[PDB]
Amino acid sequence: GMSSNLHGIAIGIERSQDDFYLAFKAVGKLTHEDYEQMTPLLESALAGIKTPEIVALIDITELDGLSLHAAWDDLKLGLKHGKEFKRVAIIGQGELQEWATRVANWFTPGEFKFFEDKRDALDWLC
């Protein structure tokens, strides 16, 4: 009964033309340890920001899900930093993920919008 599944969150700051954006790529089944590894970089990225200025891209194309603890870490990060994001582009596949993006958008102050194409997402995002 063993398993060696690939998972994690990649975080970076990317560029599209003359705009910088915060990029995430969530892969596999996320754990609390994954949120822990990513949190200091996120805190570094948002240092000094107290207004809705940030735009982010979150690629969930290879995301399987979140552990229970990870789901709580995620909500904690949203409660703590979410107001600082004005727009969030979600990149995934299918209508069920589109629907989940619309549900997230209802809950959040920043504008969340779903895409399948990165170039479309970046055009809207920045």
Next chain:
Amino acid sequence: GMSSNLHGIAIGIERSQDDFYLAFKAVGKLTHEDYEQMTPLLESALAGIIVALIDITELDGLSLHAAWDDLKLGLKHGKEFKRVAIIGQGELQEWATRVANWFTPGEFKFFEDKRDALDWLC
């Protein structure tokens, strides 16, 4: 970043002379999915079978959700285990075993060598 750590639980019935025990090996950082893969096997074993052996030499720990599944399993089934040999290394794992022993109705004892453990286990 990315990772692909090995984790899981091996379970099965084993022999020591003309005598049997339930063997567990806990590897890595255990998750809820690991507990769900393992539970139906544990139940079939208990319907068919008590003393057990738990190898923690390669155990890192349990996720929050898994610690809960684990406690749920101990509350349901631990009374059925009269003796539990914990196979591990070091005094921190021994201490953890002694703490577990205090909490539980069966006798839990720490060993470094499987052969020494099986002599006491059955």
